[PDB]
A paper describes a structure:
The bison [name]ΔN sample preparation was subsequently optimized for grid preparation, cryo-EM data acquisition and structural determination at pH 8.0. The final cryo-EM map of [name]ΔN in detergent was estimated at 3.0 Å (Fourier shell correlation (FSC) = 0.143 criterion), although protomer A was consistently better aligned than protomer B, and was therefore resolved at a higher resolution. Overall, the structure of [name]ΔN in detergent has a model resolution at 4.2 Å (FSC = 0.5), which is reflected in the fact that some side chains in the core domain and the connecting TM6–TM7 loop could not be modeled, probably due to flexibility. The observed additional N-terminal helix TM –1 is part of the dimer domain in [name]ΔN and is domain-swapped, mediating homodimerization by interacting with TM8 and the TM8–TM9 loop in the neighboring protomer. As a result of the tilted angle of TM –1 and the length of the connecting loop to TM1, the [name]ΔN protomers are held apart by ~ 25 Å on the intracellular side. In [name]ΔN, the dimerization contacts are small, made up solely from interactions between TM −1 in one protomer and TM8 in the other. Although [name]ΔN homodimerization appears very different to any Na+/H+ exchanger observed so far, the [name]ΔN monomer has a high degree of structural conservation with the outward-facing monomer of NapA, but with the additional TM −1 helix. Dynamic elastic modeling of the nanodisc [name]ΔN structure shows that TM −1 is indeed flexible and can spontaneously adopt the position seen in the detergent structure.
The Na+/H+ exchanger SLC9B2, also known as [name], correlates with the long-sought-after Na+/Li+ exchanger linked to the pathogenesis of diabetes mellitus and essential hypertension in humans. [name] consists of 14 transmembrane (TM) segments, rather than the 13 TMs previously observed in mammalian Na+/H+ exchangers (NHEs) and related bacterial antiporters. The additional N-terminal helix in [name] forms a unique homodimer interface with a large intracellular gap between the protomers, which closes in the presence of phosphoinositol lipids.
Numbering used by the authors:
A (entry chain A), B (entry chain B): 78 to 293, 300 to 517
The structure:
């Protein structure tokens, strides 16, 4: 009599090797332990098992253990071991492309899940929260960094823009899960945070690019990117609410690919044209415009996108933590960098609390919004790599040394504020605004 | 208001180009019109539309037009036009690999649909039908060709083996439709023809290889191929009836994928090792062992394999008909080749009729069996291409001319007897054994 315990494993093993051989025939060395495709699958599995372990094995009693910490730790262990990192290697273009795709997935889901009429009721708070804390934190961090490390204003201002950048990837999943359940009456608070933390990305890169050029105009170029992004999103919006009608079938599957596929294509086309970052605004506008014109087909396509986002979630964080090979063990008095990021994070809490004292937020809503700007994600990692690449083209040792310090504080910030911030908002949601 | 008729096409077009752009990013090449992957998709679509046109627009009134004729014409047009020959091209390695995969699909489906206890009731007639008419037809064709074309016995014997060959790639779909429909009482007649005309490929290639070596031992090697195939099939048979059990879930998809993958792996492993054709019998034995196990999910997985076979059927015919550019317009007294082909077909009818006069087949069954061995398939094309490759390595003008003549008659035979034979058996099914 066959045994189910000894038959499930055998069947799965045979299926895996059979599928492995098929891809090996069409690719070759990629499926070999040393290759790109093999590394992506192994990194995907490593991130999956890391998330499961962090939350089901050693989870804390009262606060559930978020999988974000496990994903970053899994990527850190993979890259920071020469024998392990030898087999799994990923090209820079694939890492950048996967980052752009995953970032587009979380943005379109936020726009699709955003509630209408929220902008009309309160738009000033969203604009002030998008511009206010980002500029104040960058200035305060630059001043705090100045006269402490010795680097000039060109490096100080550049570090401030990189350090202050709210990341949609780490906040949107928290808001949508909270919004689906809901505590009390959600008066647009989840929509306010989701929309506000999107325009920040454009300003952060625009300031970073302009400041980088000074260390080597672009201010007007960034404005054109915002204008183009709105126009491109608006044009694509009318072609998703009109061509797909009730006459067509398979509405759930057909239109989910359409909105997601155009979102990915828009970002790559904008980046290839010469003005990156306009795609991030285009997908949000396209998703918001589509929701305006959907025939109550919101939750139908939300489930498909949610599954797609859940797939890319381990993949996105795995790439972020798998690029710390250079500074694996380089003790260079990192305590000073901790103080610089810690003060700026502390200032970030205070300024965000101040900006939400106008109306509506009486007592508890101020605290939740202030703590919702803690986590950081790929946005810092992408610009940080670009700064290193520009530095290591015609720069001498001093420029290389300064660039290394920027990487250390930027990587450390993602290690600290991302899992703690995501964990804090998860447990404080049912404990602050219920 | 949007119009569904004018929007469905637009939605489909946008989806296709968006999906096409995704492949462009993943694959650095093969996406342009000059790529081989683009040609595969075009050939697949051209064969699909060709089959639909031949049978739904200009179909004859009483006899339905089979799609086999349309597939051959569609492939012929693509290759036989100079401006449509260089823009779209397909490499030889992919064509050879796809032929083996398509051949494996029809073999496993034929074995799965085979009726149990059919071999035990009458196996002598199956062996005689497999060996008798095939060898006699090859000998008669060589003698008939001799004293007519002037080629020596080395070329005459090789032509006879290539000309005389029964392939299940065409007859099995006709038999399965007959089995599914049912007329009167089916005493294993469809299964008898499928089983007898399944392992004849091994004998055909063994004779071709033996004759090629003499024209440049193999008999002993061919016997070993049969022995290895039976042993591999027997061992693999117990691994599909035991490991996949009712305890697991999604048996329909899991078992169908498992048998398809193992069949492909066995054929590729045998071909790469140095003895091609052994995997052809191995999948038949493996399917027979799976059929004898009686998993009770035959019809559940037959539909899935039938859909897969229906997908690969235009692809297999498209590759065969896309290698006729060499002999597009070469008038070299082809009437003699037609006469030799007609006599060989006439000889095949007589010998097949003689071998089915033992028992059971009273009047109508003899006619059906004789007409069931007329259609031919890729078996001739594969060996014919090998003969051309061997000829064009150290051969002079006379050998080159002889090799071209062998291809012309072989290509002509496939063009004639395959669609006419398939059409003839299709209309005679409900009119002979009713």
């Amino acid at each position: 009599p066959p045994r189910g315990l000894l038959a499930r494993v055998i069947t799965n093993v045979t299926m895996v090797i059979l599928l492995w051989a098929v891809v090996w025939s069409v690719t070759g060395s990629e499926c070999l332990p040393g290759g790109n495709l093999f590394g992506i699958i192994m990194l995907f599995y490593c991130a999956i098992i890391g998330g499961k372990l962090f939350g089901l094995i050693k989870l804390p009693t009262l606060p559930p253990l978020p999988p974000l910490l496990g994903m970053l730790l899994a990527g850190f262990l993979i890259r920071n071991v020469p024998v392990i990192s030898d087999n799994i290697q990923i090209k820079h273009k694939w890492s950048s492309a996967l980052r752009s795709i995953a970032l587009s997935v979380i943005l379109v889901r936020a726009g699709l899940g955003l509630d209408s009429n929220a902008l009309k009721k309160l738009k000033g708070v969203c604009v002030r929260l998008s511009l206010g804390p980002c500029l104040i934190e960058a200035c305060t961090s630059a001043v705090l960094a100045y006269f402490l490390m010795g680097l000039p204003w060109q490096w100080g201002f550049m570090l401030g823009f990189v350090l202050g950048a709210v990341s949609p990837a780490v906040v949107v999943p928290s808001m949508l899960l909270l919004q689906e359940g809901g505590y009390g009456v959600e008066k647009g608070i989840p929509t306010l945070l989701m929309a506000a933390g999107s325009f920040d990305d454009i300003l952060a890169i625009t300031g970073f690019n302009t400041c980088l050029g000074m260390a080597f105009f672009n201010v007007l170029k960034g404005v054109l990117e915002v204008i183009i992004g709105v126009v491109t999103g608006l044009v694509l919006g009318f072609f998703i609410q009109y061509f797909p009608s009730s006459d067509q079938d398979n509405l759930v599957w057909k239109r989910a690919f359409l909105v997601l596929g155009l979102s990915v294509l828009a970002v790559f086309s904008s980046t290839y044209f010469g003005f990156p970052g306009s795609g991030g605004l285009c997908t949000l506008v396209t998703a918001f415009l589509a929701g305006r014109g959907w025939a109550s087909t919101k939750t139908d396509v939300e489930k498909v996108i949610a599954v797609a986002w859940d797939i890319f979630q381990p993949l996105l964080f795995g790439l972020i933590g798998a690029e710390v090979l250079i500074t694996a063990l380089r003790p260079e008095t990192i305590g000073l960098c901790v103080a610089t990021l810690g003060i700026a994070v502390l200032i970030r809490i205070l300024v965000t609390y101040l900006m939400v004292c106008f109306a509506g937020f009486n007592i508890k809503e101020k605290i939740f919004i202030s703590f919702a700007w803690l986590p950081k994600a790929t946005v810092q990692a992408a610009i940080g790599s670009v700064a290193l690449d520009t530095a290591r083209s015609h720069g001498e040792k001093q420029l290389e040394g300064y660039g290394m310090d920027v990487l250390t504080v930027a990587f450390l910030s993602i290690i600290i504020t991302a899992p703690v911030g995501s964990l804090l908002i998860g447990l404080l949601g049912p404990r602050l605004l219920q």
